[PDB]
Write a protein that binds this ligand. Structure first.
Ligand SMILES: N[C@@H](CCC(=O)N[C@@H](CS)C(=O)NCC(=O)O)C(=O)O
Length: 207
């Protein structure tokens, strides 16, 4: 059985859990990460030198990096409906997957660590606000794209890209910041409510 190493509250672990549920995979999950089981130990470092979650073990195959993992699962487990093989259709998904990780995630760092994790190391109000402002600019880009599609992030159909993106939106909505009205974003999160795995792993009260 596929093994998922990572605490269930982690946004990046939740990408993998949601993907597994969408595809129809059986899995066992072990708690790893801050607050759960420390990752900076030899047994875990041997699997992932970053000492971060998620990591998966699929038979003898070990893989880390959440967006790489969800791509792997969709490619391995009959996920062509979720992550299409056509290069242009796949690219429309990849743009948002990759931007989620390289830009959107990056933008929320200080505000999230300060306000949600209450990190004693992140108490500079100016940096909290800078992070909130930058995050807000990235959310306006998400709003623009959803205004255009009127549906899902990459087009008319739910796709792999909606998993990192909707989890990121959830983080925005659950962090205690003042937020501009983004109606296409709200309508999108309402649309997703019909998906059981979204309710289980995304909009579940955990930031
Ligand atoms: N880029 C990595 C980031 C992984 C990451 O930052 N994981 C967090 C949890 S969301 C973590 O393991 N922090 C270290 C810890 O909890 O000890 C990915 O997307 O998988």
């Amino acid at each position: 059985m596929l093994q998922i190493l990572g605490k269930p509250t982690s946004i990046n672990v939740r990408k993998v859990l949601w993907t597994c549920a969408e595809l129809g995979l059986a899995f066992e999950r072990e708690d790893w990460g801050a607050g759960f089981r420390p990752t900076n130990v030899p047994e875990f470092l041997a699997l992932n030198p970053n000492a971060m979650v998620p990591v998966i073990r699929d038979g003898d195959f070990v893989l880390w990096e959440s967006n790489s993992i969800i791509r792997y699962l969709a490619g391995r487990y009959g996920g062509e409906w979720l992550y299409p093989a056509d290069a242009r259709e796949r690219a429309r998904c990849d743009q948002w997957i990759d931007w989620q990780a390289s830009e959107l995630n990056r933008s929320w760092s200080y505000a999230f660590l300060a306000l949600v994790r209450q990190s004693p190391a992140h108490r500079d109000a100016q940096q909290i606000e800078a992070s909130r402002a930058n995050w807000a600019k990235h959310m306006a880009i998400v709003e623009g794209q959803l205004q255009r599609t009127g549906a899902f992030i990459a087009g008319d159909a739910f796709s792999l890209a909606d998993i990192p993106i909707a989890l990121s939106i959830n983080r925005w909505l659950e962090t205690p910041i003042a937020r501009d009205d983004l109606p296409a974003v709200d309508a999108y999160m309402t649309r997703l409510a019909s998906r059981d795995a979204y309710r289980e792993y995304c909009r579940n009260g955990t930031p």
